[PDB]
């Protein structure tokens, strides 16, 4: 039906006037198949007959459920959308099934036709005009308007969700020890109670609904597991996740690929990894809802991706409050990290993967930490408290980072786990110069230009070299310097550059890079036994560094 | 005494709309602080339930403030602070005074109760709006707005002054040598007496204040006396390697962009070659001219350091090591107002960012109390770091900005 309830107040942006957006013809078929479904809707009082003073338009389609011959209307709102005001946030959070509790007694509602339940504001409602047209392109044009929340507009799903918010909480509050999650309009209808009187407080919730013209179809969750809500399936024991199928298309039309993102934009919050970027792409730029656009070498690999990335099943157990969160982390081909939180031994609440960072340079102990906080952050969210973490890692390895490290950094309470690999640092730079070892003075250059450059030392002993090198940079040249000492030099060496630069990249010890030659570097000073960097000013005329100049 | 009163208009800086900051995830026990605070603070009429045509948002949490059991909520008004007009009541006519920073004690009081009796202007409420958070996100989230001054943002201040005026005037007659000066929600009241004597000043303005509509919590203590300053120094050996004097002629290089009577050049000379760095160096070239010319230059203040009230003070932190961190505040590059070091929760202690959460806190309060305002730090931090503890140990009623950086071997420089 419609309920009663008041109506949200709704604004276009400031400055903005509604959409005044031209109609295409359509087929006889749906100049016809369309004039049926208004007609049940005008009955129902859905949408409302309008005709002269309204210069507004948005357009209209018609499509057919490929099995059964029902044509459904689809309204093109794109454009009222950029045109309507901002409302604040549909959760980019849905709930995680392993954040249930167990209910002895389970219930799972939703509404059928939730959005025409729900009044529009009736000063906003001229702004949904939309027409169809006319097939013996003699009349003048059907002209109908939106008296409830349309599919598709803007606002309809944050202003839904508000109503139900509304209309459930006097019930809510009267019945406090049932928990109600209500993601839209799909209610989890959680309690304590015997079937005898769940089932009853059940009947005067559909009837607290159905008083506000709220339906609960007699298509309720059977009271009866497996239970399907918000895409899970609800063991008494256990959850998992319905495996999500991406059509797989020859042809795209705007409409399909804008269904694709929306789909896969619910999914990446239960699938880390899925990208919609070379995706959201292709809906650049206002192309009729049915022009079929080609997808983009890189879109039609991203979509590729993404399946792959849902193939994995995904299940897990339910929370126990008496019992605390543990959460344990795995170091795993360079670079991820799987981890696993749960109360029990092997009965996992939730696992993941966590991908390194965007970082140019990075260790493995300080990827171990982004991973911490990311589970922490994680948990936080979905139980309400951080996890005791068990970890690759010993309270010496950390201590000698949390002491060396010059920025500040922490890890929660943990207890050290000895699967290997272990995290570690791989090398140590001498806090005092190496006495007896013999003292490179590197030092490096290019032409901003031509990008050519010098790169060199000069030791203690009289050692001297120089190697020219094409296509590189300052900052390069210099690393470069630093790597021949590198490697012109004994098991113990003290390197001593004028470049800060360099200077910040070996001194965080790295022990994985993007550039090659850091990773040269890196491995070069792993087998040495004492390596200690000193940094002097540039130009200064310094040490041997004034005189390493050979350009 | 401002209650059934006509609100006071207020605007947004021009150009600028409202805030739309995301509500970070809170925990089970936050969320049920700020669950009934928010639905007490309902029923008392001072915030109300918001539909969602409201587009804003600014992030809410609680705190346990400086050793209570009572949470008290704490709203980031910074972004709101920052698109808010800046107030023409401009009480810019109450300068901060100098003498605060110079008495024996300093007492903080948090007046922020006397806001929630003033109304807020009906337009300017939606700009309020917060959302308290679910577990697990399985309702929607407590959306509120305030209809009275709130606590944290910057023009309850503005806003209030005169009727805080009128009701310090009493007690400052007949107390003509307390030092009273107001920050957002809190009172900083000085005096040169003797501990006791002051203890006692303060236990009487409070009751003083509070029979005046003004409630504040019983019975935070400062001694700006011997708040101290941290002077660029240098070693001093029998014995000097080539290292200890290129790390010697480095430092003092960089210590030439803060003062330029600085020279290098008996000591640029001592590196004429390219010697092992281990070979002790002899003391040559009279340079005892050099490092101690230049050991004496790191005692006379920078060719025109001083605060210009128009600028913002900047605050960078190094972490030392083994609990000790330094700090300096300054409004340009090198002309330092002050530099120092925190150094406090030393030997026994393992927690980075609870120390620099109260690194901040601490150089915040020394900001205040000698300019009123406070810095925008320069945290040597990661984000992620910073914003995943952060707020498990704040514990004052103000936010102040900051960004995140790279510390590189300016820690040498200031150790
Ligand atoms: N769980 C959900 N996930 C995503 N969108 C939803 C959800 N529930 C409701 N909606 C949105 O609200 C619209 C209106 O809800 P409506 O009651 O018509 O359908 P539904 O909740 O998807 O299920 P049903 O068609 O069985 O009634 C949907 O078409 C959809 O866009
Ligand atoms: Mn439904
Ligand atoms: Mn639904
Ligand atoms: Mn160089
Ligand atoms: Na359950």
């Not at chain 1, 890189?298 to 543990?326: C, Q, T």
């Not at chain 1, 030791?459 to 300052?474: E, F």
Request: contains cysteine; aromatic residues 10%.
């Amino acid at each position: 039906p419609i309920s009663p309830i008041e109506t949200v107040p709704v604004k276009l942006k400031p400055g903005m006037d509604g959409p005044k957006v031209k109609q295409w013809p359509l087929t006889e078929e749906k100049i016809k198949a369309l004039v049926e479904i208004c007609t049940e809707m005008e009955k129902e009082g859905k949408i409302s007959k309008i005709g002269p003073e309204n210069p507004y338009n948005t357009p209209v389609f018609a499509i057919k459920k490929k099995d059964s011959t029902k044509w459904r209307k689809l309204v093109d709102f794109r454009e009222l959308n950029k045109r309507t005001q901002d409302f604040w946030e549909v959760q980019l959070g849905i709930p995680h099934p392993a954040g249930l509790k167990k209910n002895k007694s389970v219930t799972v509602l939703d509404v059928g036709d939730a959005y025409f339940s729900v009044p529009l504001d009736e000063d906003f409602r001229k702004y949904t005009a939309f027409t169809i047209p006319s097939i013996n392109n003699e009349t003048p044009g059907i002209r109908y308007q939106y008296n409830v929340l349309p599919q598709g507009w803007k606002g309809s799903p944050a202003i839904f969700q508000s109503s139900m918010t509304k209309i459930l909480e006097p019930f809510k509050k009267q019945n406090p020890d049932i928990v109600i999650c209500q993601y839209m309009d799909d209610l989890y209808v959680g309690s304590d109670l015997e079937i005898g009187q769940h089932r009853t407080k059940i009947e005067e919730l559909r009837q607290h609904l159905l008083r506000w013209g709220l339906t609960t179809p007699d298509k309720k969750h059977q009271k009866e597991p497996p239970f399907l809500w918000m895409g899970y399936e609800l063991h008494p024991d256990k959850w998992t996740v319905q495996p999500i199928v991406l059509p797989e298309k020859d042809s795209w039309t705007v409409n399909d690929i804008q269904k694709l993102v929306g789909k896969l934009n619910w999914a990446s919050q239960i699938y880390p990894g899925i990208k919609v970027r070379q995706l959201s792409k292709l809906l650049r730029g206002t192309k009729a809802l049915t022009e079929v656009i080609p997808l983009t070498e890189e879109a039609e690999l991203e979509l590729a991706e993404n399946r792959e990335i849902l193939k994995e099943p995904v299940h897990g157990v339910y929370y126990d409050p008496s019992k605390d969160l543990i959460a344990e982390i795995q170091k795993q081909g360079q670079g991820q990290w799987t981890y696993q939180i749960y109360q029990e031994p092997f009965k996992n609440l939730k696992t993941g993967k966590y991908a390194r960072m965007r970082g140019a340079h990075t260790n493995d102990v300080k990827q171990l930490t982004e991973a911490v906080q990311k589970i922490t952050t994680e948990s936080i969210v979905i139980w309400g408290k951080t996890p005791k973490f068990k970890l690759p890692i010993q309270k010496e390895t950390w201590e000698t980072w949390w002491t060396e490290y010059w920025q500040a950094t922490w890890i929660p309470e943990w207890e050290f786990v000895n699967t290997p690999p272990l995290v570690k640092l791989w090398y140590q730079l001498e806090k005092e110069p190496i006495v007896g070892a013999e003292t490179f003075y590197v030092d490096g250059a290019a032409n901003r230009e031509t990008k050519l450059g010098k790169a060199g030392y000069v030791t203690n002993k009289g050692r001297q070299k120089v190697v020219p090198l094409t296509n590189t940079t300052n900052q390069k040249t210099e690393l470069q310097a630093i790597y021949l000492a590198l490697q012109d030099s004994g098991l113990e060496v003290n390197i001593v550059t004028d470049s800060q630069y360099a200077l910040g990249i070996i001194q965080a010890q790295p022990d994985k890079s993007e550039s090659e030659l850091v990773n040269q570097i890196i491995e070069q000073l792993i087998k040495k036994e004492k390596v200690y960097l000193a940094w002097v000013p540039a130009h200064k005329g310094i040490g041997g560094n004034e005189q390493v100049d050979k350009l | 005494p401002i209650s059934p009163i006509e609100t006071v208009p207020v605007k947004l800086k021009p150009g600028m709309d409202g805030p739309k900051v995301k509500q970070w995830p809170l925990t089970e026990e936050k969320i049920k602080a700020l669950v009934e605070i928010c639905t007490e603070m309902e029923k008392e009429g001072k915030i109300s339930k918001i539909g969602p045509e409201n587009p804003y948002n600014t992030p809410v949490f609680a705190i346990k403030k400086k050793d209570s059991t009572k949470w008290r909520k704490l709203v980031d008004f910074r972004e709101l602070n920052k698109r808010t007009q800046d107030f023409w009541e401009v009480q810019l006519g109450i300068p901060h005074p100098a003498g605060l920073k110079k008495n024996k004690s300093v007492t903080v009081l948090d007046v922020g109760d006397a806001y929630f009796s003033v109304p807020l202007d009906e337009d300017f409420r939606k700009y309020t709006a917060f959302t308290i958070p679910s577990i697990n996100n399985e309702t929607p989230g407590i959306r509120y707005q305030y209809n009275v001054l709130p606590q944290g943002w910057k023009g309850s201040p503005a806003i209030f002054q005169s009727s805080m005026t009128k009701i310090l005037e009493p007690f400052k007659k007949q107390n003509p040598d307390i030092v009273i000066c107001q920050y957002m929600d809190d009172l900083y009241v000085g005096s040169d007496l003797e501990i006791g004597q002051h203890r006692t000043k303060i236990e009487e303005l409070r009751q003083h204040l509070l029979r005046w509509g003004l409630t504040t919590p019983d019975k935070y203590e400062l001694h700006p006396d011997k708040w101290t300053v941290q002077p660029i120094v240098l070693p001093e050996k029998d014995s000097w390697t080539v290292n200890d004097i290129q790390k010697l002629v480095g430092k003092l290089n960089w210590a030439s962009q803060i003062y330029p009577g600085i020279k290098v050049r008996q000591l640029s000379k001592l590196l004429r070659g390219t010697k092992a760095l281990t070979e002790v160096i002899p003391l040559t070239e009279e340079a005892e001219l050099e490092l101690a010319e230049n050991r004496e230059i790191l005692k006379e203040p920078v060719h025109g350091v001083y605060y210009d009230p128009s600028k913002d003070l900047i605050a960078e932190i190094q972490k030392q090591g083994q609990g000790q961190w330094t700090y300096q505040i300054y409004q340009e590059p090198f002309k330092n107002l002050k530099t120092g070091k925190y150094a406090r929760m030393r030997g026994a202690h393992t927690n980075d960012v609870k120390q620099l959460t109260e690194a901040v806190q601490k150089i915040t309060t020394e900001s205040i109390v000698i300019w009123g305002k406070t810095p925008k730090f320069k945290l040597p931090i990661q984000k992620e770091t910073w914003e995943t503890w952060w707020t498990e140990y704040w514990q004052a009623t103000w936010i102040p900005e900051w960004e995140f950086v790279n510390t590189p071997p300016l820690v040498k420089l200031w150790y």
